[PDB]
Each structure stands twice: as structure tokens, then as C-alpha cells.
């Protein structure tokens, strides 16, 4: 029940705000009782009172005053301490998260993390800011109300408390509606905001198969269900609202049931009774607008038990923990017995079954095994991201657990097969790798890293931007980088992984050779796949099914006749905003009709009451008056009922057409963003999370831009103009002073009701980059964990978010402030309007009624239009966002993907012919790869390409694609201009292969299908794929066959699995012409020759191209190509390349 146990002086400052918000409660009550009093006395007299009245509105200042100050003072602790406990909980959840161990982050989603630790917590911050004092306050008040009505009333008070419970439920069921808004919209709309959070993570993928079509059915389908769910929100709050607007007609008429009872009634004249009606149907507000703290409890208690469940994981293995201790004197030695593991996703599969290895110090050792042998298992192993499950592990003699992760990952850096990095500059990746290189380890690993071309003839050497997951930056670029940041922390146990043998070879010697510079000084762990990096090693281990079958060095294999020797034998406005007229026009006036009745709705029953005043005034007027006092009351709750009819009708029609609106917008939305060109998605501007706010965060403010500040609009406007007219015809000298305060007193009650809109609204955008920081932590939290940078990561966030808690607590303060002096001014109008009237009253101007009719019509309507300004959103920036959407829908790509017009061939012949092809990136279009080269491919030709890394081999399959267009030259498609053809045609049929394809997290069977968009891929063709890749054998030995589950980035596969996969579904495409990039790759190069050969049993009847560093794929080809810095220095047989000396004849030398 109980949650709060830090911060004692908070505690202490809660009890005195709640104690001032209770004092508060009670003085409204007695404000009550004064104003009863006062007409009383007003009444009697009118069957000197000059002082009595001064003596009055003195005591009506001071007790404003003070009810003021308290509501401020109360107010300020209150969102105090909410901030700070806000502060304190997201501190410790972050400190928990950086102790987490990996396998808990395995077990629960990091999306799903990231979810929870912000919706969690704002929902705690938004019902624990205020909900807790206004309930309080409220409780007071009702408690107060009650108390009078039972020592005053008798039958009335009975009456009163007897009907108060109706009201009471249905302000309290209101409150908790109006309160509870973005719990209903943003959860039902999670579903559609991930889905296209995957859709945008994976675009590129997208355009290249073109399989826009199910992603729109996807989003189709999840606007429908939230507009769906908006609906019946919105009709529930309709009801609710008619309701609570039926409630105040049934008090009234049961208040006029008096009659024949007259003002005396009991004992006390009319004063006394209407005093106890105002008390009573204070008390009923109070208790319904109580109800929204309770309604939220269960919320809070259920979030903050979330919240301490994850911060009370207290795991064995702590990254906090002072029992271990820190290694000095770590020579070089790992030794691993009986080593093993099993995954947390497949605890059945067992990839280690027990092995016996030994590395010394400056010993570089390889490992050699089959698909999924355990290599990158083994390396993860190592890093200690999990644990081992039977064995010994350990390093320099010493168990792991000695040092902990903490000592383990701290003191060793590893680089995995595809190393992630982030959409920064060279130069930040750097630092975030070491922070305290000081410029020169940076530079020393720059040296060694051999990156010198990409770093100097780009811009911006040091500060060169790439893009999201490094996509500016090629694959061998991004290799070097990750190499140079491992470099740069100056570890002691080296872990490399693909280094460069990605593209081409050539490039490998020239990094291989600077890994020899420095191999001695620390032991180092490399996987190798190349004749000649094996050779370089100085000792090689083979390992099969988790076991080391052979240990040596490389003429020490080759003599064992084991699997080293098998391998190498086989190798060998208006108009702008108001859009809602095509769908709205037959609507939006019946919605005009309602808010007009709306503005009549607050003055005429402001004039009807005031006909009841006087009518109990002048001692009730006389007994014929009883029969007018009736007719009054029967009128207003007929107008009563007619406002509420027209109010719930005017909310369902309101809902109804936003709901639509939304709906199209995001429609449209969606069908611009896949309608749009490669190139606009490659900007730091068009970012994943920051796209996905805007799209998320645009139905809302559009909303509140247009309906709902059009209905609040003309429900001010009405209700100004009634009161100014009603003031004028029933007031001569007292519309003045309610004239003066009209302004003031709107302000107060716009900025009068919870307005937590804005605080949150404010919030997000501050914490906008806290939050975008923990995304990227949690995300890369294996990275981090690696390099035991969890304390820098939670002081830079703790950094980041103290900004925004300072203005969150100026925020809170000056809303706090806002809200006392709205009710300072109110209590002071109220005095100063009592004033104004008894004088008027002394003097023979107006008669009493008329001026007390006068005064509650203006302050009636004022209150009025200040709670339709607060409550319903009006002109803010929602409107600017509405700018970028619009200009958005409006853009237009400069490449026509969505427009049909393209030539059909009769017939694809599979024909190629590029002459004098120049292309520039976007980007960085000062530094061009192609200078003209040419290219010409025939029907059932196998094409390979070598060269440089980064030559524009690449550059070129992509452009193939349709991807971008050349500057200048000539490309054609069996002698037909590319540009003149249909573009999703062209790419579907175009079975493309990336470097890094992007596999979707679902089921293998759901992302083969995939592959084959726009047609039902049956269980035949995945079978089919299968075996072709030779996946079948796999899939069985996996659990759950084609079913299982895909992670994070495959985080249930290995880099050699994602691209069998993807080969596989390009395979399952059908695509008349296949290009693949980094196919072959490390991926277990044994096991790749299977694959391979049997591509080249399927490359039949089809034009093929495979990128790769191994010469013996590149030999099967039918013509290979080697650009030199994007010229093709030569092309032809391979015999014609081995007699020339050119650089495919020194590469194949070296090799
Ligand atoms: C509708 O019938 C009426 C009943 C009571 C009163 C005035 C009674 N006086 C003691 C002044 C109290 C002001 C009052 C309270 N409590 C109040 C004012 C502003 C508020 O913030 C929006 C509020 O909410 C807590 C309550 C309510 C009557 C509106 C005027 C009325 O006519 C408008
Ligand atoms: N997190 C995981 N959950 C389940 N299975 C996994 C996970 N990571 C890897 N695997 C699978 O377990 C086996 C581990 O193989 P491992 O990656 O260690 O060997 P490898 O020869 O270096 O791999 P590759 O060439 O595919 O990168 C492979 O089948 C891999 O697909
Ligand atoms: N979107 C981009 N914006 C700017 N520069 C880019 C972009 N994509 C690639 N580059 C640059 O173009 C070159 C990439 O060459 P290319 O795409 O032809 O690859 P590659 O030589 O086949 O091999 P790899 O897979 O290693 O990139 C590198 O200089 C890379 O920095
Ligand atoms: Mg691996
Ligand atoms: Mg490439």
C-alpha cells in the first residue's frame, strides 16, 4: 500500500501541503456559509447595512487570501515532491539497469524495457503529482459541506445528502474519464506506433523487395482498431457528460420541491437553505472530482510494483560488488575446460559440449570449425556475456568470479563478426570507444588501422557523419573503424572477427599485415577464413560439435589430415488545415448547431437562476410568486436536459470527426513516407525515433488544433457575448467592475483546470534526448557491458535529465502560482461584487436582483469559458507540427515510385550495358567513386567484381537497383533505359543481397514469406529455399522448425545463419537477375563452399553477381572484373587476368 520511504523531510513537507489543501477544503465550505449569510441579511434588509457589507467583503479578502496562500504552498510541495521522487526512481532504475546482468536483459525485451521504464513512469509522475492533494482537498471539502448541512438543513439537508450519491458517481466516473486520456489513446495506439517503428527500421529492405503493400494493410488495420477504440472512449465520456449535466437539473428541481414550505422552512429563513444547497452541491463536486486520485491508485501501486520488482533483481552477478578484486598483473593466459553453454532462447540445444583450450600471452590463436561450430559462441563466451553451464573457464590461472564481469569485460575489447556503431561522427564513435584517449591512442589506432583514404578524401576527416547503424559508411570502412576504436582502448586480449575479408581480399593484407605490427604484446584471438591468415596464425585449433579435435600450428595440421586440410584441399490555413470537409462537411455543422446551444446553455441558466434569487427574495415574493418560482424551476431543468442533449452530441460528433481525420492523416502519411525517395530516408533529419514521434505525436495535436479548438472558440465567444448582453439589459452601473474582471478571470480559469497537457507535453520534449540515450544504451547494452562503461552512461544521463527536472519543478512552481492567484482574484471578485451590489442596493440605481443577476451571469460565464479554454485544447504549437505533416503529404519525390508510368518489356532477356556511368552520393556528392566506368552482362552470365575496398562495387549493384540515378553516361536493361521502366517491377524481380540485410523479429517462416511480396508463399518454397541453402538440416536441429522466434537484430542466430537466411529468401523471390554483397564472408567458409556450389547449381538460366575476397567463389565465375577506384582496369576469362599482371593477378599471388 505504501511505496514511499525516502526523503522523510518530503514526507513531512507532503502532510503539511495535504494539511493546507484539507484547510482549504473547509474554508470553501465556510465561504459558502458567508455568502448565505450575506443574502440573508441582503433579503431581511430589503423587507444601515453599509458596515455589515464592508465587514463582510473584509472578511471574504481575508479569507481568500489565506486559502490562496494555502492552495499555492500546497500545490508547490506537492509537484516538489513528486519531481523529485520522479528524479530518485528514475536514477535507481537506471543504476539497476547498468547492474543488470545480460541474461536478464536477454530474457525481457529492450524495447519492451525501454516501454515500460518511460509509460511506467509517467503514469506514476502524472498520478502522483497532484491527484493525491486535489483528492485530499476534495475529501476536506466534502467532509466540511456534510458537517454544516447536518447541524443546518434538517429535511433539506437530508434531502441534499440523500441525492448528493448520484451526482457524486457520476462527477466522480466524469473525473476519471477526462483525467485517464492518455492511457486510452497511447496504449491502443502502441501497436500501430512499433509496427511502424519495424517498418522504418527496415525501409531499405522494404524498398528493395517493395513490400510497401502489407505494411500499409498493417497500418490500415491498426488505425482502424484506435479509431475504433476512440470511438467508444469518446462516446463513454458523451454519456458521462450528459449525465453529470442531467445531475444538476435533478438537484434543482428536487430543490425547488419546497414551495408551500417557505424561506422559513425549519427554523432558518432563505439564507440558511440556500447556504446548505451551495454547501451540499459543493461537497458532491469535491467528492467527484476526488474520485480521479483513487481511480489512479491502482495504476501507481501496479507501476511502482513494476518498477521495484525490476530495481529489486538483485542478480549474484554485480557490477557494483566490492567482494571481487581488480587484476594487476594479468599476463596473457586463458584456459577453458569442459566448456559448456547452452542459449537462453534454445536451453535444449547445447552448442558447447565440453573443450579443452589453452592460450598463452603474445600468442595469436585461431579457431576452425564447422556452421555454428561455436566460434562466435566461444568469443561471446570469453566476453563473458553469459555463463558457463558446466566446464571451468579461466584467465591467468584465476576464476572468472574472482573479478566478476566487472574485472573480466574491463580489461579485454572485442570485436564482433558486424559491429554496431552509432548515426555520429568518426571522431564521437571514437571517444565513446575510450574517453580518455586524449587524441593520441586515437590517432596511433588511426596509424594502424590503415584507414587513411576514407578518412582523408572525405569531408570532415574527424568529423564525417554516417549514417543510422553506419550506413553512409561502407562495410569495410566500418570494419577499419571498429578496428582503430578497439585499437584505441588498448586491450589486453584482442578479439577479431571479419576483419576485412568482406569484399575483396586485397584490402585483407594490407589489415592483416598491420594486425602483425602489434600481435605481441597481448594475447589475440582471430577468426580466420583466408589460405593466408590461417597460415599467419600462429596456432590453429579445431573444433567440432564443441569439442577441440586439433591444436597446433598450420604444417602441424596439414599433417593430421584433419578438417584444416579438407578445407584447404576443397578451396584449392484554412484551406491547408481544415481537411476534413470531404469527410466532415455533412457533420461538422451539425457539431456548429450543438456549441452555439453550448453558449446559450451557461448564460441562460445564469439568468434562470437569478429569476429563482429574486423570486426568493423580497420574502419570497408573494404567494402568487410560488406558482412563477415553479414555472422558473421546471424551465431550467428543461434547458438543463436540452444542454446536455446538445453537449453529448456535439462530443460524438467531435470524436467521430477527429477520429476520421486522424485516420486519414495517418494514411496519408504512410502512403507519402513509402512513396518517397531512397535518398530523403538517408538524412539526419529524416531519423528513426524522430520520425516516429512526429507520426505518433501528430493525431492529437491536429486534433486539438482544428475541432477542438474551433468548439472551444465559439463556445467563448457565445457565452462572452450572452453575458455582455445580459449584463447590459439587466445592469447599468455594476457591469462595469464584472467587465474589468472579465479578463483576469478568464486567464484564471483557462489556465484554471489540471492542465497537465502541457507539463507532460514540456516533459517529453526535455527528456526527449535522456530518452533517446537510454534507447541507445539499452539497445547497445552488450557493447557497453563490454567495455564496463555503465558509470559513464548513468552520469551522462543523470546529466542530461537534471536540466530537464529544474524545469519541471520551475513548471510545477509556476502553475502552482497560477493556480493560487486564480483563486485569490476569484475570492476577491466575489467580495468586490458583493460590495459593488449592496451599494448599487443603497442607492435607487438598479434593484438587487438585477444586479445579482448581473454578477453571477458574468462570473458564471467567465468560469465557463475559462474551463471549455482548459479542458478542451485550443491554438497552441500543434498547429507548426501541422506545417511539417502537410508539407509532408504534399512533398513529392524526385523519382515517381507510386506513379505507374514506366515502359513493359515484352519479354527479360537478363541483358546489362552501363557505358560512361558517373554517380555522386547525396551527401558527400564532392568526392564521386565512378568516373565512367562500363559494364556489359548477358543472359545466364556469372559476373564477379574485385578491387579496393570501397571501389564502387556497391555503389553500382545499388544503383542497379534503382536505388539512386547516375549523374552522367548511359544504363540499360537488354537495351532499354532503366529509367523508362517500371521501378517496383524492376526491384522485385531483382534479388538483392546487402552486406548487412536487415532481418525482421518474427518467425523464419513469416520473414522467408516475406521475400515474395505481392503472392502466397507456401510451405513448398521455404522447404524448397531451404534445401537449396541447405537450411532444412538446420531448422530441424533448431526448436520450433521454421517457427522460431527472431530477437533484436537476430540475436537467435549467428551473422553466418542471417545470411543463409537472406540468400534464402532471395532465392524463394525468383528473381531474374541476383546480386549478393559479402555473401561468402567468414560464415564458416567451410560450410559456404556448400552453399555456394549449390548457388551455382541454381545460377543456371540466370545472371548472378557474388562480391567476395575468396578467389575460388570469384574463379566459377564466368568473367571477373576488377574497378580501381571505380574504373574497370580489365575484364574477362580468368585465364586472360592470370597472364596479365594486374592487380587480380597480385592479389591472387598474395593469396
Ligand atoms: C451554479 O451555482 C452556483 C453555486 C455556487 C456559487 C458560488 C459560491 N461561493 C462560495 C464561491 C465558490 C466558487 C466555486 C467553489 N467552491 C469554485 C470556483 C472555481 C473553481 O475552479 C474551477 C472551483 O473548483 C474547485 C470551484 C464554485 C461555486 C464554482 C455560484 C453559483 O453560480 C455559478
Ligand atoms: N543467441 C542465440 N540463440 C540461439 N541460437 C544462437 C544464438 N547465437 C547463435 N546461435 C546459433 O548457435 C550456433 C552458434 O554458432 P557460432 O555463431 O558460435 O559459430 P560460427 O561458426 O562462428 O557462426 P557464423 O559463421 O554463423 O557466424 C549457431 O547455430 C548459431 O546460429
Ligand atoms: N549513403 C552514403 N552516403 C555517402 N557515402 C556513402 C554512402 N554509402 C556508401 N558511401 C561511401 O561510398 C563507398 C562505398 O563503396 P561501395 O558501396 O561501392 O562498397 P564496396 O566497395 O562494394 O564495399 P563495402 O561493402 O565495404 O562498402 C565508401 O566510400 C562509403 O563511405
Ligand atoms: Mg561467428
Ligand atoms: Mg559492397
Known amino acids: 500500500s505504501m511505496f514511499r520511504y525516502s526523503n522523510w523531510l518530503d514526507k513531512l513537507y507532503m502532510v503539511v501541503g495535504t494539511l493546507a489543501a484539507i484547510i482549504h477544503g473547509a474554508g470553501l465550505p465556510l465561504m459558502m456559509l458567508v455568502f448565505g449569510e450575506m443574502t440573508d441579511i441582503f433579503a431581511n434588509a430589503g423587507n444601515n447595512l453599509e458596515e455589515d457589507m464592508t465587514r463582510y467583503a473584509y472578511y471574504y479578502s481575508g479569507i481568500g487570501a489565506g486559502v490562496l496562500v494555502a492552495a499555492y504552498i500546497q500545490v508547490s510541495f506537492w509537484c516538489l515532491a513528486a519531481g523529485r521522487q520522479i528524479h530518485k526512481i528514475r536514477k535507481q532504475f537506471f543504476h539497476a539497469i547498468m547492474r543488470q546482468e545480460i541474461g536478464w536483459f536477454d530474457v525481457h525485451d529492450v524495447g519492451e524495457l525501454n516501454t515500460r521504464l518511460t509509460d511506467d513512469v509517467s503514469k506514476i509522475n502524472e498520478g502522483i503529482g497532484d491527484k493525491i492533494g486535489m483528492f485530499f482537498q476534495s475529501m476536506a471539502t466534502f467532509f466540511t459541506g456534510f458537517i454544516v448541512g447536518f447541524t443546518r438543513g434538517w429535511k433539506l439537508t437530508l434531502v441534499i445528502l440523500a441525492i448528493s450519491p448520484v451526482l457524486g458517481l457520476s462527477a466522480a466516473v466524469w473525473a476519471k474519464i477526462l483525467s485517464s486520456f492518455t492511457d486510452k489513446e497511447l496504449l491502443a495506439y502502441a501497436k500501430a506506433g512499433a509496427v511502424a517503428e519495424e517498418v522504418l527500421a527496415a525501409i531499405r529492405t522494404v524498398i528493395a523487395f517493395g513490400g510497401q503493400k502489407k505494411e500499409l494493410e498493417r497500418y490500415n488495420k491498426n488505425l482502424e482498431e484506435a479509431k475504433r477504440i476512440g470511438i467508444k472512449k469518446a462516446i463513454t465520456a458523451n454519456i458521462s457528460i450528459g449525465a453529470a449535466f442531467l445531475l444538476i437539473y435533478a438537484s434543482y428541481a428536487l430543490a425547488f420541491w419546497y414551495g408551500t414550505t417557505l424561506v422559513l422552512s425549519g427554523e432558518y429563513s432563505i439564507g440558511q437553505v440556500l447556504t446548505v444547497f451551495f454547501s451540499v452541491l459543493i461537497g458532491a463536486f469535491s467528492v467527484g472530482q476526488a474520485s480521479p486520485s483513487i481511480e489512479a491508485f491502482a495504476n501507481a501501486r501496479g507501476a511502482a510494483y513494476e518498477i521495484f520488482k525490476i530495481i529489486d533483481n538483485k542478480p549474484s552477478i554485480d557490477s557494483y560488488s566490492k567482494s571481487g578484486h581488480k587484476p594487476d598483473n594479468i599476463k596473457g593466459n586463458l584456459e577453458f575446460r569442459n566448456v559448456h553453454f547452452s542459449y537462453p532462447s534454445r536451453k535444449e540445444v547445447k552448442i558447447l559440449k565440453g573443450l579443452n583450450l589453452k592460450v598463452q600471452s603474445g600468442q595469436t590463436v585461431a579457431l576452425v570449425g564447422n556452421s555454428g561450430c561455436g566460434k562466435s559462441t566461444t568469443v561471446q563466451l570469453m566476453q563473458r556475456l553469459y555463463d558457463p553451464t558446466e566446464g571451468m573457464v579461466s584467465v591467468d590461472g584465476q576464476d572468472i568470479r574472482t573479478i566478476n564481469v566487472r574485472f573480466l569485460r574491463e580489461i579485454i575489447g572485442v570485436v564482433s563478426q558486424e559491429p554496431v556503431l552509432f548515426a555520429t561522427t568518426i571522431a564521437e564513435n571514437i571517444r565513446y570507444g575510450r574517453e580518455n584517449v586524449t587524441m593520441d591512442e586515437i590517432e596511433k589506432a588511426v596509424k594502424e588501422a590503415n584507414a587513411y583514404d576514407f578518412i582523408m578524401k572525405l569531408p570532415h576527416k574527424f568529423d564525417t557523419l554516417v549514417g543510422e547503424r553506419g550506413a553512409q559508411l561502407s562495410g569495410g570502412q566500418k570494419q577499419r573503424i571498429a578496428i582503430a576504436r578497439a585499437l584505441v582502448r588498448n586491450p589486453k586480449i584482442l578479439l577479431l572477427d571479419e576483419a576485412t575479408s568482406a569484399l575483396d581480399t586485397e584490402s585483407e593484407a594490407v589489415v592483416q599485415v598491420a594486425l602483425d605490427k602489434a600481435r605481441k604484446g597481448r594475447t589475440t584471438i582471430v577468426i580466420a577464413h583466408r589460405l ?37 584441399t576443397m578451396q584449392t490555413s484554412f484551406w491547408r488545415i481544415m481537411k476534413l470537409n470531404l469527410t466532415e462537411w455533412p457533420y461538422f455543422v451539425v457539431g456548429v448547431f450543438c456549441a452555439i ?114 468548439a472551444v472558440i465559439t463556445q467563448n465567444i457565445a457565452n462572452l457575448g450572452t453575458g455582455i448582453i445580459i449584463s447590459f439589459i439587466y445592469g447599468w452601473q455594476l457591469t462595469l467592475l464584472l467587465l474589468a474582471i472579465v479578463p483576469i478571470i478568464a486567464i484564471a480559469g483557462v489556465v484554471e483546470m489540471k492542465m497537465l497537457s502541457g507539463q507532460a507535453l514540456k516533459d517529453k520534449k526535455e527528456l526527449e534526448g535522456s530518452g533517446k540515450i537510454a534507447t541507445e544504451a539499452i539497445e547497445n547494452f552488450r557493447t557497453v557491458v563490454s567495455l564496463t562503461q555503465e558509470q559513464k552512461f548513468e552520469h551522462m544521463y543523470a546529466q542530461s535529465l537534471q536540466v530537464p527536472y529544474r524545469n519541471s519543478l520551475r513548471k510545477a512552481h509556476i502553475f502552482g502560482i497560477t493556480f493560487s492567484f486564480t483563486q485569490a482574484m476569484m475570492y476577491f471578485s466575489y467580495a468586490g461584487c458583493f460590495r459593488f451590489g449592496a451599494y448599487l442596493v443603497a442607492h435607487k440605481l438598479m434593484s438587487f436582483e438585477d444586479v445579482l443577476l448581473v454578477f453571477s451571469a458574468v462570473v458564471f460565464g467567465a468560469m465557463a469559458v475559462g474551463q471549455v479554454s482548459s479542458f478542451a485544447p485550443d491554438y497552441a504549437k500543434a498547429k507548426i507540427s501541422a506545417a511539417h505533416i502537410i508539407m509532408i503529404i504534399e512533398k513529392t519525390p524526385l523519382i515517381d515510385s507510386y506513379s505507374t508510368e514506366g515502359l513493359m518489356p515484352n519479354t527479360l532477356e537478363g541483358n546489362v550495358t552501363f557505358g560512361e556511368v558517373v554517380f555522386n552520393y547525396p551527401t558527400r556528392p564532392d568526392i564521386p567513386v565512378l568516373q565512367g566506368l562500363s559494364l556489359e552482362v548477358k543472359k545466364g552470365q556469372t559476373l564477379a567484381l574485385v578491387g579496393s575496398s570501397g571501389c564502387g562495387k556497391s555503389t553500382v549493384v545499388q544503383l542497379l537497383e534503382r536505388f539512386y540515378d547516375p549523374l552522367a553516361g548511359k544504363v540499360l536493361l537488354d537495351g532499354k533505359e532503366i529509367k523508362r521502366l517500371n521501378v517496383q517491377w524492376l526491384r522485385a524481380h531483382l534479388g538483392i543481397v546487402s552486406q548487412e540485410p536487415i532481418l525482421f523479429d518474427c518467425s523464419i517462416a513469416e520473414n522467408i514469406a516475406y521475400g515474395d511480396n505481392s503472392r502466397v508463399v507456401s510451405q513448398e518454397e521455404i522447404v524448397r529455399a531451404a534445401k537449396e541453402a541447405n537450411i532444412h538440416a538446420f531448422i530441424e536441429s533448431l526448436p520450433n522448425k521454421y517457427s522460431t522466434k527472431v530477437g533484436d537484430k537476430g540475436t537467435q542466430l549467428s551473422g553466418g545463419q542471417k545470411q543463409r537466411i537472406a540468400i534464402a529468401r532471395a532465392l524463394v523471390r525468383q528473381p531474374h537477375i541476383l546480386l549478393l554483397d559479402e555473401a561468402t564472408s567468414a560464415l564458416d567458409t567451410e560450410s559456404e563452399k556448400v552453399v555456394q556450389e549449390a548457388l551455382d547449381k541454381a545460377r543456371e538460366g540466370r545472371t548472378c553477381i557474388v562480391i567476395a575476397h575468396r578467389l575460388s567463389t570469384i574463379q566459377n565465375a564466368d568473367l571477373i572484373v576488377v574497378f580501381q577506384n571505380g574504373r574497370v582496369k580489365e575484364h574477362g576469362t580468368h585465364q586472360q587476368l592470370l597472364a596479365q599482371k594486374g592487380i587480380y593477378f597480385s592479389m591472387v599471388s598474395v593469396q
Do not use: C
Not at 538 to 544: E, M, P
Not at 550 to 568: A, P, R, S, T
Not at 639 to 650: N, P, R
Open 532 to 568: 593466408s591468415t590461417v597460415r599467419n596464425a600462429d596456432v590453429i585449433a579445431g573444433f567440432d560439435d564443441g569439442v577441440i579435435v586439433e591444436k597446433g600450428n598450420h604444417d602441424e595440421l596439414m599433417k593430421e589430415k584433419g578438417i584444416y586440410f579438407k578445407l584447404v
Open 597 to 710: 446551444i453550448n453558449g446559450g446553455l451557461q448564460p441562460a441558466f445564469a439568468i434562470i437562476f437569478s429569476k429563482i434569487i429574486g423570486v426568493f427574495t423580497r420574502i419570497d415574493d408573494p404567494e402568487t410568486k410560488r406558482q412563477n418560482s415553479n414555472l422558473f424551476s421546471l424551465l431550467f431543468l428543461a434547458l438543463g436536459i436540452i444542454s446536455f442533449i446538445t453537449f453529448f452530441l456535439q462530443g460524438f460528433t467531435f470524436g467521430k470527426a477527429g477520429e476520421i481525420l486522424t485516420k486519414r492523416l495517418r494514411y496519408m502519411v504512410f502512403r507519402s513516407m513509402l512513396r518517397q525517395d531512397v535518398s530523403w530516408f538517408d538524412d539526419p533529419k529524416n531519423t528513426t525515433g524522430a520520425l516516429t514521434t512526429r507520426l505518433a505525436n501528430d493525431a492529437a495535436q491536429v486534433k486539438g488544433a482544428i475541432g477542438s479548438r474551433l
